[PDB]
Write a structure and sequence with these properties.
Two copies of one chain form a homodimer. The first copy, chain A, is built from three helices and five strands, in the order αβαβββαβ. The first copy, chain A, is 29% helix and 20% strand. Chain A is α+β, with helices and mostly antiparallel strands and 133 residues long. At the A-B interface, strand 3, strand 4 and strand 5 of A face strand 2, strand 3, strand 4 and strand 5 of B. The complex binds chloride ion (3 copies). Chain A: It comes from Human herpesvirus 8 type M. Chain A: This is ORF 73. Chain A: Residues 15-132 form the Protein LANA1-like DNA-binding domain.
């Protein structure tokens, strides 16, 4: 079964391929990236595309105190037959504002690097808080 | 990389372990289990627990026209060190009403089978629609 990505206590623990995107995010996010005990995890950003490799680096990059990305997952088949897999990554946050910021953080990264894929995305809102405390 | 659950054209195509739960969901959901082109995929139910095998059965059980579950995924480690894994499964719906019905569909199953694990769940709302059309 799938395992959650290994959390980084420091910068050097992140894989080399996802490191520059990670560094970009740590600086981009700033304070928002830090952990807030007062806020509940009821918000997330869903990223989806056809390339799991790119979503993997996004997943590996988004490992912070206030931003934690789940592993690479996928959406169910849209049709009655198996289709080309649409992969996806849920990037969980503590507040709605951080979710919007993460969404743009990717947009900033995509505009900076044309090699990166044009990921589709959406803000996610949960009714109950998730066990990430 | 992870793969999405297989879609069924008929009940006999559903995996054997998930068949008893699938047939129950097909009846309970009834008309709500069917697909609506007019509706957009902006809603979901996230189930989570410690047992991936139960969630895998749930995942395989929920495969309908208007209700489709993703594979067995998981939530990230809460702390800097590794802790016992919290597995999860998103069940995608077309409306909030159906998502509530799916949520209680499992609760009905849990009430129907005390052997089944007690899965924590929450309704999900997406700002932008998801590509599960046509
Ligand atoms: Cl990329
Ligand atoms: Cl959005
Ligand atoms: Cl809920």
């Amino acid at each position: 079964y799938q395992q959650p990505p290994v959390p980084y206590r420091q910068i050097d623990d992140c894989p080399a391929k996802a490191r520059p995107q990670h560094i970009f995010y740590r600086r981009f996010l700033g304070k928002d990236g830090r952990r807030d005990p007062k806020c509940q995890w009821k918000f997330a950003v869903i990223f989806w595309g056809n390339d799991p490799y790119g979503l993997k680096k996004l997943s590996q990059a988004f490992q912070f105190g206030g931003v934690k990305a789940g592993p690479v997952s996928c959406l169910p088949h849209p049709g009655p037959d198996q289709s080309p897999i649409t992969y996806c990554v849920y990037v969980y946050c503590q507040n709605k504002d951080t979710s919007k910021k993460v969404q743009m953080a990717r947009l900033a990264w995509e505009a900076s690097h044309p090699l990166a894929g044009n990921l589709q995305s959406s803000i996610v809102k949960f009714k109950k808080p998730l066990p990430l405390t």
